[model samples]
Target: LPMPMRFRHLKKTSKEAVGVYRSPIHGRGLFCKRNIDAGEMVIEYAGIVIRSILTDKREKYYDSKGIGCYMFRIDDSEVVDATMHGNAARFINHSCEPNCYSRVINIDGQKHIVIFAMRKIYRGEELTYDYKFKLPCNCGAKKCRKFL
Candidate 1:
């Protein structure tokens, strides 16, 4: 069963839609309610430290669980998969000429990924992040199948 989530609300950004909490996995995350200008800081992805089970099917298990969307790294002995834990980050949407880019930063000893504004954003525009994955993108936007 999918897990339940709750997200803190900000002032109304638009009437078209509102960002909500619906992470596929267990955790809280944030998304966009309207078109956000390029270079805007979306939100931070956070989670708890859990044990990672070493797998032998590395080649066969090619991110099928949808863990290839955002930036995550091993901290200590835990493996973080932002896409599964932060569903709002998934709503960042997909764009050919993406207006937002995922910025990776190593703050202190922790690694993080945040979306930044890249261009002008308009109302009703679904904010997107430059998803870098070994998998192919099938967004069907005029420019499909491009390197993330």
Candidate 2:
């Protein structure tokens, strides 16, 4: 059998995980900077915390100002507001054939959003996830679901 669970500080260990650039699918997006295997942790969605109720009010406020919203839901009562103070992870776009997926990773009495690779990802590749919504996806993957 394999060894027991290992502990990690969960720090952003690698500084070269990803980078930002003009993407063909969206305005600006994050790209893989190194090879990533399936189930590998890509990056964490860093932001400030706020109650779920506040999300609605702030989202509308940002919307009124014609600003894009970037928030991640951890539970029905809490969410991370990244509209103003988020890392490069916010620029990651959605796709029909997502190479990454979101997971709520909890450690040391904390809840966080972590994006994991869905399959083998190479350098210079785009990182994406299923927004789990109905939108005209432009990923162009052969198995593209047509709608993101």
Candidate 3:
């Protein structure tokens, strides 16, 4: 069985931001509901199941949704569509110093990208991850583009 993403309980911290779903145009697009450490499994992303379709053209319906939403292939048959998994997973957010990472593990002929805790965290810190595969970030942060 898969986990639910509608609601999540994060450790309480003074710096935590209020939990709200805001689009990227808002600048505060994604943030921690509480402080998170260097490495930690803050949240799980999920939602609709997307079939991996390949084409020479770069434009696609899912484009701008984020790399995390795309089911890129690891091999001929292995693909990961983190989107169809859950909602909170969609809220996992992006950051320069992301606290978590995805590891593709094959089980029973199925490959699952297991998100694990990478470091300690604080309260109110937004749980963040890296979508370096998504390309250059327009966040304009002092330290913006870097490979994950």
- Candidate number of the best TM-score: 2
CA lDDT of every candidate: 0.47, 0.80, 0.45
Tens digit of lDDT per residue, candidate 2, span 1-148? Answer: 1111222533565357788999998789989888988877777788887998999899999999999999877788988888998888888888878899987767677766888889999999989988754467778888888775
TM-score to true structure, per model: 0.50, 0.82, 0.49
| Model 2 TM-score, 2 decimals | 0.82
Alpha-carbon lDDT of model 1: 0.47
Off by over 4 Å in 2: 1-14, 65-67
lDDT computed for candidate 2: 0.80
lDDT of 3 by residue, 33-116 (tens): 555555444443332323345421222545654543434334454344543454344445566765567655444554444455
Q: What TM-score does structure 3 among the candidates reach? A: 0.49
Model 1 Cα RMSD, Å? Answer: 9.5
Question: In model 1, how large is the Cα lDDT of residue 66?
Answer: 48
> Per-residue CA lDDT of candidate 1, range 1-148, in tens?
1111112231232223336454331233234566665555555444332344532242135366644544244444544454345535534555566667765546556555555668866654455554544555544467666544
| Model 2 alpha-carbon miss at residue 114, Å | 0.4
